[PDB]
Symmetry: D2
Subunit: 476 residues, 4 copies
């Protein structure tokens, strides 16, 4: 852009070239001109006096956009669309007086935004699908690896690394379905006139409603949409922007939860992000391993959540057939939501492709904590061997207190099993202690739940996206 002015970090640091391009002025104004060509083409076929020469001029000059002239004209007219009409007309002097014929500014403005929304959603969907697929592979691989469960972030009944990963995956699958739904539900604005009544076109076609309806259908079809709104004011209802940014906000929340979990696992030393060979962690310590990619995801996911309040507020105060207090806001929030989303999905894909697990750290933490969770199982085995529940409970309470004192008052390892092994009272069950403290037998149905979840819910969703799976996600 130029380092002497503000540049959005979404453009200069974060988002992919593809998404940056979709929200560029080239893409936008090229699409405006495309829409003016389609209007002229359709109008000519329906019988307005537009010559093939005029159409040919416009077709030749679609990419030939003098941005300097349009800026100068916008300065003079204070109207972006008319600046581009006059600028396109300068290029195309024979076609000049039939460009924009019958239309209001939103014919190009709103229809271009809808085309952009659809294309932007189409870039996110494969990226999200890739993330889900990579995590699903990880989940399958680690379906049966026991790990300490956490509720209130305190030690809890064991889960597996893969099962925990399915918590993440499930949230993303709900996003995938939401994004798909919203993408398929988008309708074209079409040709509607200044207040949505098509009065201008009805006059041009001298009272022929059928021709007005066909014009709407023709441009809708050329733009690649199955359906147009029947009802609009000047604009498509800004409720559409709420629907889109809601599903992105929800996705942000999922990503934030996942990346927060990953950051905590990094503190625990159970799991880590990928690391580049020459990557530095800190100014003081290059070897320090910070989960910086996950941190960035959270940071940007938060912005995605924040942004939902823009279109909510905007839609809620749109007066009658349109007010222009939506316009500047939308220039910002629509682009930034998609660029932020794009960034988080590229980054999350990158993280999921390089996740490192440390099984021996996981095991160590289980050995520390499992003895306290297994006291009930040891009492029951003692009862089965002919002991009284109350005696066994008082004896386990005393040995657990000795062990708890070593942990908390002395900073030592949990030795509760070695204490039970060395007490004659528990000699009826000493031979069973290997069985009663097997971590795999404390994981419930975790590995089965993973298997069932991947077959029944995940793989069916992913099957449509096979062809986009081989792309690797790089970062700078």
């Amino acid at each position: 852009g130029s380092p002497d002015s503000y540049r959005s970090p979404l453009a200069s640091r974060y988002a992919s070239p593809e998404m940056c391009f979709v929200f560029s002025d080239r893409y936008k104004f090229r699409t405006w001109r495309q829409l003016w060509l389609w209007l002229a083409e359709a109008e000519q076929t329906l019988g307005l006096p537009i010559t093939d020469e005029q159409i040919q001029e416009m077709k030749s000059n679609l990419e030939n956009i003098d941005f300097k002239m349009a800026a100068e004209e916008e300065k003079r007219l204070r109207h972006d669309v008319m600046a581009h009409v006059h600028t396109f007309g300068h290029c195309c002097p024979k076609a000049a007086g039939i460009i924009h014929l019958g239309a209001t500014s939103c014919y190009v403005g709103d229809n271009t935004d809808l085309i952009i929304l659809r294309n932007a959603l189409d870039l996110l969907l494969p990226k999200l699908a890739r993330v889900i697929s990579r995590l699903a592979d990880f989940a399958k691989e680690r379906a049966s690896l026991p790990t300490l469960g956490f509720t209130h972030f305190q030690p809890a009944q064991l889960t597996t690394v893969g099962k925990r990963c399915c918590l993440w995956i499930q949230d993303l699958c709900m996003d995938l379905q939401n994004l798909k739904r919203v993408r398929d539900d988008l309708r074209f604005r079409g040709v509607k006139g200044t207040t949505g009544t098509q009065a201008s076109f009805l006059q041009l076609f001298e009272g022929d409603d059928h021709k007005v309806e066909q014009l709407d259908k023709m441009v809708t079809e050329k733009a690649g949409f199955k359906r147009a709104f029947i009802i609009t004011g000047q604009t498509y209802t800004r409720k559409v922007d709420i629907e889109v940014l809601s599903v992105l906000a929800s996705l942000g929340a999922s990503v934030h939860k996942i990346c927060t979990d990953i950051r905590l696992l990094a503190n625990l030393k159970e799991m880590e992000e990928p690391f580049e060979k020459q990557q530095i962690g800190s100014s003081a310590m290059p070897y320090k391993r910070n989960p910086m990619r996950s941190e960035r995801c959270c940071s940007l996911a938060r912005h995605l959540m924040t942004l939902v309040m823009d279109p909510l507020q905007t839609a809620s105060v749109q007066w009658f057939e349109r007010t222009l207090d939506d316009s500047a806001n939308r220039r910002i929030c629509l682009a930034e939501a998609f660029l932020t989303a794009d960034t988080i999905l590229n980054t999350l894909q990158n993280i999921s492709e390089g996740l490192v697990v440390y099984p021996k750290v996981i095991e160590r933490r289980i050995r520390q904590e499992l003895p306290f969770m297994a006291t009930e199982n040891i009492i029951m085995a003692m009862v089965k061997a002919g002991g009284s529940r109350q005696d066994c409970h008082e004896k386990i309470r005393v040995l657990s207190q000795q062990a708890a004192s070593v942990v908390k008052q002395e900073g030592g390892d949990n030795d509760l099993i070695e204490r039970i092994q060395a007490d004659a009272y528990f000699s009826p069950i000493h031979s069973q202690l290997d069985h009663l403290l097997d971590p795999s037998s404390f994981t419930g149905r975790a590995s089965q739940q993973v298997q069932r979840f991947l077959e029944e819910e995940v793989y069916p969703l992913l099957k449509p996206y096979e062809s986009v799976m081989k792309v690797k996600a790089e970062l700078c």
Copy 2:
């Protein structure tokens, strides 16, 4: 009691049926119902629970000592265990098989899902009624010209009915969203402390099939088709985002609609209903309340977004108190807005002569091109006509803005001999009905193709007055 804070959602606004769904009676009755279903299903699958124990629990589902549960919660600092001990006091033989194998969320989360489903089922008919009443209004007024507004400045005419379709369309998107979310809800079922069902697997001595059947049995008794396969301790809090998103979106629609109605009241084109002994001056107070409450609905979406985003691992308890507030308030607020909006839509008054007057003020400026074209068709030169119309329009604009007068552009054209070829046409060239484009057809097409198909499922709940 007026000596403590009472939520105005209970004391002023929401219907008794929505208030009841979020009551402690409803909640704790459902907890006990869920404990009965667990014991019933556990007994069938072969755990040593006696018919006497089950009979005790069945007898005492409604018999809730709230005072004792509060006292017990004070002692234990645990709401679910307080209700276990309290239910056990009632049912001394069954005490000690209540909650067997379950974690607290077995009653907590499953009850919230039952509540969400029932709350959505109350909103849906109300929203359908609102849409139906507005659709009736739209049909009735499909062809009534009214001044269009963009930038809230005079624009190409629309119709009262067509404008009403803007409102209706937004609400129809909400209706579909609410239905979707309602149908997508899954039961949590029986999952254990961390979602692995380890406790139940131990009770059934390693039999996975029995664990899966227990989950299926309680899910079915609760009236759900499907349970989650994957959970931690809780159902994913993403569900709360889905629900409160569609309510926030609805809030935004309602706010737009009620804002339009308030503006129409200033214009004197349309008014709310009025009681005979109502005290103000005619204020659109119901629409104002709708906006006020819709705003809160929009605000509330940030609660579940924030909550879900910081849920660590298999669950943290920092969701709980927040959810006690935002879930109930979202539904009670939504309920209130829909009842109130239905009431407004049933009594909308239109003033066609005020509408007409405003059209007469503004239409002459929008009709200048049509008058020039009629002059050209009658043998005028177009440049002459354009310069003459420009001068008379400027005189008329000056009378409107600089003198506060009525637009007299037509009387100026009538009194100029130059325009005598078209004086007889002036009634035709300024007919408001002919400036409305395809508005009335758009209404007709929209009601047949999009609105009536949505409403057909809700016929039986249509006759209720708000």
Copy 3:
């Protein structure tokens, strides 16, 4: 209330009786009647024909509120203020036609809300001051106790338990100042008439501006405010609600950060919130130690942050001299913000009074991690003893990698010091290793920063609140 309808958990579970009472209908409608009395009193003094009998009727019946009648009248009139005028007039038949004389509904509605906001802020301030004082005591006590620093939640240069506690305290001190500022900046609406012009009162006093200004001054003073707005529409500007709920949202953010830290320290086993003797953690495991109070604080702090969007949106669409789309929203968000805030501060005070530290767990974690952070100091001691910087660096890099592998690849304890002890190359510094790994010497200026911060910034702020310091914070849940 009644268990057959929805009851706000802010009333039934969380907030103190004092805060619940300030937002009660009794408090509100009593204050309406008080304001009508003050108006009549002041109007009589300034010469309107209001009799002492009429004033006496009103004075007798301030607390004597027939809620059933007011509800019935509100049903009929659809106007809460007029319902209460007619209801007050029914018990005061002689005064009936001079109640509300010259005033618009906001004379009671808005002025009562301002009185409530001021009194609600006055309940929060001492609670926040107590929290800061309890944390300050903890900070002083633990000013010198080394603990592992965390950035990115990864091991970092050591801090102290007390210094970390000052991070918490500083945020709350910024809240204290904000709450005080907003509390002191509140102005009374006073008597302004329907559109803020006082036209009604100017007519009653037959053109005498001086009397209108005195009436405004008199009721303002009776309500205990130093200043009234000069400029209003029908209402006080709703920007005031933004100012108040902003500082509460900010406070929510501080509390959430603090309680999040405490929850993480509980996982680390370095610090815990208090526990009752008969408290249960889980229905599966009674002994499991959940930081449930901190979790509730976070949960409620979040709601406080969420609520800031209500008054922002409300103020931004108030048309002209007032629209009524503020009213229902304000009934909810003002009360809930204060009740939520009250709850969080009581609960946080309770937590701060019972914080337990486990120094041996803290020490153990330092022993695990400090060797990696102390490599530079060991190299420098080797250089000073006549070794080459590059040789020492290559040797320490290899032993650190062996030690890191034992930690991560083998799940072992950090043995880097035992590796350095067993390498002959480092024999010039083996005797120094106690000195070079002393945790106290890695804490920089932490304990001094605490001391300076408590003397210069904290204690000066607390001095005004001495007399309310001895109150203990109880929880029923």
Copy 4:
């Protein structure tokens, strides 16, 4: 380049001054300035840094190879180290003393605080100008009657100037808030990796006094009166909440004002200097300002211990956009306020339509109710049921019952006499509250 996304805040809206303050040139020049100040102060306190090294750094503050820094950031994945190595490349003699003892936030956070203060200093005069222009308008129109609106329905008359004071008062609250926040900003200073200054304490061989002086010296060179005593790695992110709160509040004020102006444009009573497009843009951007407050609230609330990096990317976006949006709104609002157009005859006409209904009580009192109730109902029916002008006065004029007051009807319906104390309130408000605030600017 039109082939990538460009923020409209840069390409359409904000002033060059504000754009520049949030540019990468300004940022990385400030990083280098802070490294120079650190070296200067460190040398004075006795660390072995030569005058030549300091001179190299001073020469090359503006001389930033962005291409090299980007390449280095690609390799290292660390923005600050990339700029250390890049600054060291152009300053080979100084290379090994740059960043000595400091953590990355020494440049990152202190630069943001310098930026916040400079950005606030650009907004303050603009806001003061807006208030001054509106105050002029208010004084000029203090006595001009206009219809009051509550529920946007006709209400007791106010004046154009008095209504303008509603707007002004909100902006004055913003002015005070912005000033307060600007003056209360504290410098982070030199604090080390976790806020303990351990690194500096080691460099100065145990001398606390020298560490405290270093902190004081860089704080003074940056132009701040006060530094934090207490930090973690960062300045507390509560500061970002304080700043964006006052901007969100300002957004709300601007949105209210511009919403009022848009409604007055529909009424044809007041216009911008057809469509109130500038006011519409203000509202649109004000909304974004309000939205943004949730970013720093969320960010601060989940900052773990002595810092987590999940604040960083968010802050790159929201801090800049809040100030650029605010700047735009204030420039635009100033432009609007410089030549607001009033149409007194439209205002008068609307008063003539509505005043007769509000003046019924005054006519009854002059007579001293069922007769006025019946004629008002006839007149209301002509207005609403027939779309006619209010003829209540002509009905009273034509009824013999009211012949005792027919001559008084001009007096009893004079709009100026229905405005209460509006013009006095304006005068008192401008003298006592507004002008004292403006005098500093």
